[PDB]
């Protein structure tokens, strides 16, 4: 927390003045969109393993200055940006649906370099 | 049927009884280093570079002349097998004259290729080197006996392949001079093939001497027309002309031998 940081050190990236709850209502959203995905999905178990877990201290600890080393994710103003891509990514494999078997096995021994 | 079972550094393979260790290795693709054995020229067993250790062995077996039987895991990449190859090769290379720049075998020499794959990277020799006096057995093949390593591949080739008894290894000790002792000549109709069986530049073609080097010689496949046998041969062409002719691998027609006229 403390005095609002004038600049985050990355041009284009802006300092958000309400970062803790922005992480909160983002982090709920991936948990929300994860609801559609099946339980057997490998994505979901990994998602919930780091979503509400990392929703933990941000819910508990409110000082973003201490929150830097809570997630080892760098500056908070890009962590919420990173959470945005995770929310974005969750939408992506809501369509890819990758837990089916391979579309096609690799044709003959194409791999196995050298030739 | 009667094909005895045996392992080769792990994986097991069946094999005809009486087969030697060398002939069991290539069944899976192992070309164990050899210098005195030719698959169609007797069995010498003197180069000792075929030495590979068997499982639970107290001593390294000579893979050329050892018949393999049930349950003998060929320890190809074993430390002792590589140790045996390393020691035995340096002994071969010890008295070898420093002729690689001036020797035509350079670029296609088995001694050079072996030292790249199965060999050291420095010398521990601090003495003089043996100097064998040169010989002369014809104008078709040069004789440089200082480069010889006494693989005896020639004397077997003369004895059975060429059917003429005019090659031998006179002397004793370090003084194994392979040649003719007395002054003689070697123009058997297959005497030209004596060049290819030689693993070193000890025997080289006088007409081809100092004319080309192996890497530049583009190779082409053609046939022999000197004779009605129609031998399969490979023609060397570089910079737009032919230098030397080599026999090809054709067990039915020529095996790997060609007539002196063809060569």
């Amino acid at each position: 927390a403390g005095l609002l940081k004038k600049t985050t050190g990355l041009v284009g990236l802006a300092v958000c003045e309400t970062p803790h709850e922005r992480l909160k209502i983002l982090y709920t959203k991936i948990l929300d969109v994860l609801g559609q995905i099946p339980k057997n999905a490998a994505y979901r178990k990994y998602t919930e393993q780091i979503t509400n877990e990392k929703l933990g201290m941000v819910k508990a600890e409110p000082d973003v200055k201490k929150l830097e080393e809570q997630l080892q994710g760098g500056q908070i103003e890009e962590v919420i940006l990173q959470a945005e891509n995770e929310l974005s990514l969750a939408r992506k494999m809501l369509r890819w649906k990758p837990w089916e078997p391979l579309v096609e096995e690799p044709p003959a021994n194409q791999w196995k370099w050298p030739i | 049927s009667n094909l005895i079972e045996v392992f080769v550094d792990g994986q097991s393979v069946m094999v005809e009884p009486g087969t030697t260790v060398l002939q069991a290795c290539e069944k899976v693709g192992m070309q164990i280093p050899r210098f005195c054995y030719h698959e169609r020229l007797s069995v010498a067993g003197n180069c000792r570079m075929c030495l590979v250790e068997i499982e639970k062995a107290p001593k390294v077996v000579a893979a050329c002349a050892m018949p393999v039987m049930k349950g003998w895991n060929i320890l190809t990449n074993s430390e002792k097998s590589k140790k045996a190859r390393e020691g035995v090769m340096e002994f071969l290379l010890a008295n070898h004259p420093l002729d690689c720049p001036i020797c035509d075998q350079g670029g296609e020499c088995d001694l050079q290729d072996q030292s790249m794959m199965f060999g050291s990277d420095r010398s521990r020799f601090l003495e003089g080197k043996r100097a064998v006096e040169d010989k002369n057995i014809g104008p078709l093949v040069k004789t440089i006996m200082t480069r010889c390593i006494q693989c005896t591949r020639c004397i077997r080739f003369a004895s059975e392949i060429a059917g003429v008894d005019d090659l031998g290894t006179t002397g004793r000790g370090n003084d194994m001079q392979v040649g003719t002792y007395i002054e003689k000549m070697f123009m058997s109709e297959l005497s030209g093939n004596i060049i290819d069986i030689c693993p070193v530049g000890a025997l080289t073609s006088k007409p081809y001497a100092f004319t080309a080097r192996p890497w530049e010689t583009r190779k082409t496949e053609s046939i022999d027309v000197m004779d009605a046998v129609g031998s399969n041969i490979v023609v060397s062409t570089r910079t737009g002309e032919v230098m030397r002719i080599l026999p090809r691998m054709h067990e039915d027609i020529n095996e790997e031998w060609i007539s002196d006229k063809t060569r």
Binding site: - | Q23, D110, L167, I195, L246
Partner: protein, 129 residues
Amino acid sequence: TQDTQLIAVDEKLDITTLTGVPEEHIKTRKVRIFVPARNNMQSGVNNTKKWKMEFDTRERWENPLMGWSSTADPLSNLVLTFSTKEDAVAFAEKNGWSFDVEERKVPKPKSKSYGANFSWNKRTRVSTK
């Protein structure tokens, strides 16, 4: 299992037109296939294991000044490497080169022995060792 607006083409796949080898280098190049025979004075065999894509040699004349080997065959110094053979041929027709093969001269099993060199009736007694 890979339905993406799936279509079917039964024609043998040729890509010569898009590759764009000039029309005099597409039919007048008898492309022959073989496994390189081992150099007969090189006991090693780590060359008799693949397939190549060598062409037919063309005219090689000497340069007037410096005795070069000036050559107008752009494709002379090119060989491909193929593990097995039908891919090598499958390569061959897809650009539609004049095509032929040669079967791999596999070494026949040599029945080797060492006691034969010391026989009692048979002539395989070696005369030197």
